[PDB]
Amino acid sequence: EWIPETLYNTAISAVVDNYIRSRRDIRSLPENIQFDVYYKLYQQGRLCQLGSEFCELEVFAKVLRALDKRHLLHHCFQALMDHGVKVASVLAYSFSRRCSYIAESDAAVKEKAIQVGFVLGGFLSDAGWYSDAEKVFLSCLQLCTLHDEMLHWFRAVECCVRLLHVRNGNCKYHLGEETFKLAQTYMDKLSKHGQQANKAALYGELCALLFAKSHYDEAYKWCIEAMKEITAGLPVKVVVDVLRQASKACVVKREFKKAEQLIKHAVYLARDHFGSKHPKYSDTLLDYGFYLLNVDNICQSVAIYQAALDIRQSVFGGKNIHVATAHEDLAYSSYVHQYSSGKFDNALFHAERAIGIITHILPEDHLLLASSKRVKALILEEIAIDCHNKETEQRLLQEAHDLHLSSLQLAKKAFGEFNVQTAKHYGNLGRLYQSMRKFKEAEEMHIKAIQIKEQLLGQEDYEVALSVGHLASLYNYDMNQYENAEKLYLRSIAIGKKLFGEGYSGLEYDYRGLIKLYNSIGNYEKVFEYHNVLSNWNRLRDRQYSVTDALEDVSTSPQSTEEVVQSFLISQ
């Protein structure tokens, strides 16, 4: 066809090619042309002519006003941040200075600055630069506290709820509790004057904070209180955030039927309003992938994560913390899915990219590294055992040891000794020590893991079952403590039947462990019995696990808002 370009696109290419001479008069253009000039500068590769223009806060304020092309602004901004110029830090520092300067001005100028800060902080926290998003939200909060007017109280609540989302993503959990205390103080004195603000967003951020800190029971309580505060007038972003956080909170509490409809409604709301290529939609797919990766749904969790990564690889791609989180979450999911075959070339690649991005944009002692350095390690040992060279075996085992020890130290410093995450680190160390032929302290690691898991998650829980399964595999295969392995294997299969039924993936591993257990003690009739059970289990895995793409399983126009939340509330 070869249609000619419009006069708009031809004029853009006639202004960009004369940018350096008319850079002053471009800033006076309409806000919907200024973005097109700057996006053309990005497209031509003239990032330094562009990074010289986005660093000023006033120029970036009008660029942020174009909400239609925010999906292009995220790509442009992410292309600046890995180009070398630190646009995120510069904008935050400039906004902090301007807030500290106009703190003494009237209410209108302060309100305009607070709105500019809300949009800029929403963009920066949306782009993932959390450490450069506190300096904007903290300045907005400081602007809020000066005058005791009512809108100032409500916007201080907004500053606290948005700032709390930044710190949870930045893994500053110790300050999240103080931020929530400040927010609840502001909302208490808001309700003292006779009006109540909406508590859904704040309590959802509490749910995310406590689930990240692995306080599963209190996370469930706070997501209950969050979904008790959901109305139709809420923005769909807040609504879908609350549902996805509550869906994460429901899975760790082993209530999957509620989490099913919760995550289905969250994915539906994210797809209907935002779109199939939106970062919030990518976040909802990450939570959906977490849900599927928990309840036995592994052949589709990778497909969910690949869709989740491909959105973040396109909306804002390169070296970014959200892309790194998608790579890390996919790598563990690909590690689980591809575990049966034994090959790990792709999973290790997706784990290494998550390592190579977080180590570039975050400090080397940051918690998000710990949540990633495990995954690569969990792959390396699996590559290590399947290798054949002994030097390579030992080197990859020691590399996994270093990664697990660093992650364990970070988790122990952040949360503490008695937590689920530290117990998971202990279990990883125990299975690695089993892989490293050091079986004496492998038992100590596994028992330390189980005594912390069962104390917090109860005697019957998925993590407890997995840890005791690892301990039983240690006992029956290598430490020759066959008598103690039987009760642990029975506990593992019992918890698997209670939670996941007979379709659990680890049932194959524990049934093979039981086969080897009974072969050693010569009880051949039990060998025959569990061989028949294993064949039945394989048939079952071949029966109710059909090809059902979860991007389609969410359907279209399901139970809408005020219906899924109500059913979930009355289902308590």
Binding site: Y332, R374, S473, Y509
Partner: peptide, 9 residues
């Protein structure tokens, strides 16, 4: 495949 899978990430 001696062992089960990793706990979580």
């Amino acid at each position: 495949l001696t062992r089960n899978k990793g706990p979580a990430a």
